[PDB]
């Protein structure tokens, strides 16, 4: 009736049933990296990797691919449906990236389902390949800063619930920022892939800040800090092919851990950059299914396989199998059209502005929202300027948001770089900028620019340590007890941690599933579009327990816009009430029913004196009506309870019109 929040309300399309692979009953899952890890630990896996002549693949289809293309909206139901085939058909992947990034709060917040459930369900369905997550070192998957014991508990849970490889990064390449997360992953027995974010352009010796020696020194520190695998996270797709060959080549001479490269295909050169990385001996690369690859996402796994099959160094992927998995995503992606708004061509301006993949689409949105859709080019130019203003920083969540927030702010207020320097003490900067300069997201390389810091801080005193080291530990016992009161029953450890990470959305989620049940079970078209008249769906509550539901008709609205919806559920007719929030011949009394209270005369309604549900006695006033301006008061014909109301103040009425119903 009311449409789904945030999209154009339109009829549910007719969709193709997705192509699922036929897995003969009793086919066995081959063991893969999860078995090695379970048996011989992190170092066993590391040793195995060193032995591999072929390039290994991590598949980001279940996390980063759709974060970049479909605003992280891919729902669990669609993920669980293909998971079994992934275990059988793609058993040689190093890992499946399937958790972390934005999936944590998006699940709760926009999908109304539980990411822990996603993780645990998948864990059973895919027992043979390691699971991988993206963790911001400082704050995990959260929206702010949290005390160390929180970060530690999150990681502990994640590891237990089935995450095996934690790719840990810091938004400014500040190693201190990650130390807790890294240690907690070590403590939990799982693999640490600490990552260096790539930025700038090491082939341009004009640019003396983020040079190959910078990257090499940072590698050495991270091995020293005890990572098992070295992540290179090229979040904006800036690493060109000849730079990748040198960078990887030189890192292989410098450190003695395997290297894991992650890029985006934003510029259209991702495959080529992966080809170079592979010639330089990189160990593992990040790819997605074709249909969820390209543009701001990862390069195609199957495209890489074929780009390399006739070279000196290959991937271990079964092409045909990956093609079969891909058919599923080709079909499923249609469901998410309302979120498939990324431009989806190459975009080489990234080499100038350096906005990471997601933020480009995201920040265009805020610009359009705020009336700047016509000046999107200025905003991009300003992003570049602001990055220079900050001393040239690494831009990825959350550092990227700061540069974005200021870039918008300055275009909106017609402010130049010079204007900021001149009038900065009298300008109130966005909170993210103040927070940045206070050191609340850590310390930039080369430090903050002094003049601009003073003018934003306005007397305030920076910190120079991890914002989280100075925070009061959380009392879990106390929080748990607070949450139990709020929820009305005993929460799980995971509930608690989620509450702490995201208190407002966690409770909004609970409200939502108390009212509507675990809507996670719904097929995605129904989740987003409801049902057409005459349509029948099947809702799988649980293995073997299916609701067969048919929409028969939608009733006419009463005064407050309530409509009766007429369904059949498992052959049972069911009528449910839904308030129509946006309503764009009037009913006569059934003369035989004395519960029907009718207009006596032609006129209008001055005032309705009662509400649905109110209790009334014979002679009590129900409403007041007018006839050539001479008022009358329609009385209750007997004792009872007021039911439906068919008119509103002002409404024109004619004699016989049904006005109100009063149940005995």
């Amino acid at each position: 009736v009311n449409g789904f929040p945030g999209i154009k309300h339109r009829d549910k399309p007719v969709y193709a049933e997705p192509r699922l692979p036929k897995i003969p009953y009793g086919s066995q899952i081959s063991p893969g990296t999860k078995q090695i890890l379970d048996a011989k630990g992190p170092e066993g896996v590391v040793d195995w990797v060193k032995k591999q002549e072929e390039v290994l693949l991590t598949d980001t289809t279940l996390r980063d691919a759709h974060q970049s293309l479909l605003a992280t909206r891919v729902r669990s139901k669609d993920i669980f449906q293909i998971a079994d085939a992934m275990a059988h058909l793609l058993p040689n992947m190093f890992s499946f990236e399937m958790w972390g990034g934005a999936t944590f709060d998006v699940a709760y917040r926009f999908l109304n389902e539980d990411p822990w459930v996603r993780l645990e369900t998948l864990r059973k369905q895919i027992p043979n390949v390691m699971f991988q997550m993206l963790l911001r070192g400082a704050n995990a998957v959260g929206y702010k800063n949290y005390p160390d014991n929180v970060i530690r508990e999150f990681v502990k849970q994640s590891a237990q619930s089935g995450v095996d490889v934690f790719r840990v990064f810091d938004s400014l390449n500040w190693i201190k920022g990650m130390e807790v997360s890294i240690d907690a992953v070590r403590e939990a027995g799982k693999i640490v892939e600490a990552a260096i974010c790539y930025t700038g352009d090491i082939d341009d010796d004009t640019r003396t800040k983020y040079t190959i020696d910078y990257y090499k020194d940072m590698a050495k520190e991270l091995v020293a800090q005890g990572t098992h695998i070295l992540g290179i996270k090229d979040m904006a797709g800036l690493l060109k092919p000849q730079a990748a060959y040198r960078l990887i080549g030189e890192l292989k001479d410098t450190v003695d851990v395997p290297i894991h490269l992650h890029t985006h295909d934003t510029s259209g050169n991702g495959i080529y950059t992966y080809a170079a990385a592979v010639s330089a001996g990189v160990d593992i690369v990040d790819v997605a299914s074709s249909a969820m690859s390209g543009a701001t996402s990862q390069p195609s796994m199957t495209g890489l396989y074929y780009g390399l099959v006739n070279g000196n160094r290959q991937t271990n992927l079964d092409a045909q199998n990956s093609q079969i998995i891909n058919h599923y995503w080709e079909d499923v992606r249609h469901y998410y059209k309302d979120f498939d708004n990324a431009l989806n061509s190459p975009q080489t301006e990234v080499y100038i502005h350096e906005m990471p993949g997601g933020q480009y689409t995201n920040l265009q949105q805020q610009a359009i929202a705020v009336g700047l859709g016509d000046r999107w080019d200025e905003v991009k130019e300003m992003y570049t300027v602001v990055n220079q203003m900050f001393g040239d920083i690494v831009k990825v969540t959350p550092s990227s948001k700061v540069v974005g927030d200021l870039a918008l702010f300055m275009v909106q207020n017609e402010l130049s770089e010079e204007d900021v320097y001149e009038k900065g003490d009298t300008i109130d900067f966005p909170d993210s900028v103040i927070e940045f300069f206070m050191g609340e997201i850590g310390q930039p390389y080369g430090g903050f620019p002094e003049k601009l810091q003073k003018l934003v801080l306005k007397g305030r005193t920076p910190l120079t340590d991890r914002p989280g080291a100075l925070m009061e530990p959380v009392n879990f016992v106390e929080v748990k007890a607070e949450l139990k009161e709020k929820m009305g029953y005993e929460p799980t450890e995971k509930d608690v941690i989620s509450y702490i990470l995201y208190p407002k959305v966690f409770l909004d989620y609970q409200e939502m599933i108390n009212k509507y049940g675990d809507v996670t079970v719904l097929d995605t078209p129904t989740f987003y579009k409801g049902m057409r008249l005459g349509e029948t769906i099947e809702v799988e509550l649980e293995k073997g327990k299916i609701l067969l539901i048919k929409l028969n008709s939608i009733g006419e609205p009463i005064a407050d816009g309530t409509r009766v919806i007429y369904f059949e559920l498992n052959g049972q007719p069911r009528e449910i009430n839904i308030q129509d929030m946006n309503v764009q011949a009037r009913r006569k009394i059934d003369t035989t029913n004395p519960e029907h209270v009718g207009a006596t005369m032609t006129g209008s309604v001055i005032q309705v004196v009662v509400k649905k549900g109110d209790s009334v006695k014979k002679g009590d006033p129900l409403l007041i009506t007018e006839a050539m301006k001479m008022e009358t008061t329609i009385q209750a014909p007997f004792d009872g309870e007021v039911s439906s109301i068919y008119v509103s103040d002002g409404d024109t009425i004619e004699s016989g019109d049904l006005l109100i119903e009063v149940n005995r």
């Binding site: 009953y25 293995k543 073997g544 327990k545 299916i546 067969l548 498992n570 052959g571």
Partner: protein, 136 residues
């Protein structure tokens, strides 16, 4: 109340499927219905604790003769026994044997009984042996 049979797959449809499910529930036994595509709305499917589509792709009568898929479902659901009702597979030697192979109780007589009373001649031979009158 029962010994081994905690859950029963009813390998049938319609009236007799419902009949068996009612008996099961009265004995605190859990039930599994199966249904063909074409019986997706059949009301026997609503009377079980669980239900599964059977015979995807097959013609309608064949769907409830799909031995392999029925067994898969029984195994995947943890059924201890299968009641075949009447018609369909209730007199099928292969199906009964196949229950045996999987350690699933077939609610009926032994395979050899189905064999001996399947061909009219060996039944008549058995009547004669049992010394009871027969038709010329």
């Amino acid at each position: 109340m029962m010994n081994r049979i905690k859950k029963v797959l009813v390998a049938n449809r319609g009236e007799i499927a419902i009949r068996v499910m009612r008996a099961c529930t009265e004995l605190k036994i859990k039930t599994v219905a199966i249904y063909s595509q074409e019986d997706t709305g059949s009301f026997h499917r609503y009377k079980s604790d669980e239900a599964y589509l059977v015979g995807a792709g097959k013609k309608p009568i064949d769907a409830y003769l799909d031995i392999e898929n029925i067994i898969e479902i029984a195994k995947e659901s943890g059924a201890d026994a299968i009641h075949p009702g009447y018609g369909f597979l209730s007199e099928n030697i292969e199906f009964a044997r196949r229950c045996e192979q999987e350690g699933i109780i077939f609610v009926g007589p032994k395979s050899k009984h189905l064999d001996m009373f399947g061909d009219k001649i060996k039944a008549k031979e058995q009547a004669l042996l049992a010394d009871i009158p027969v038709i010329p």
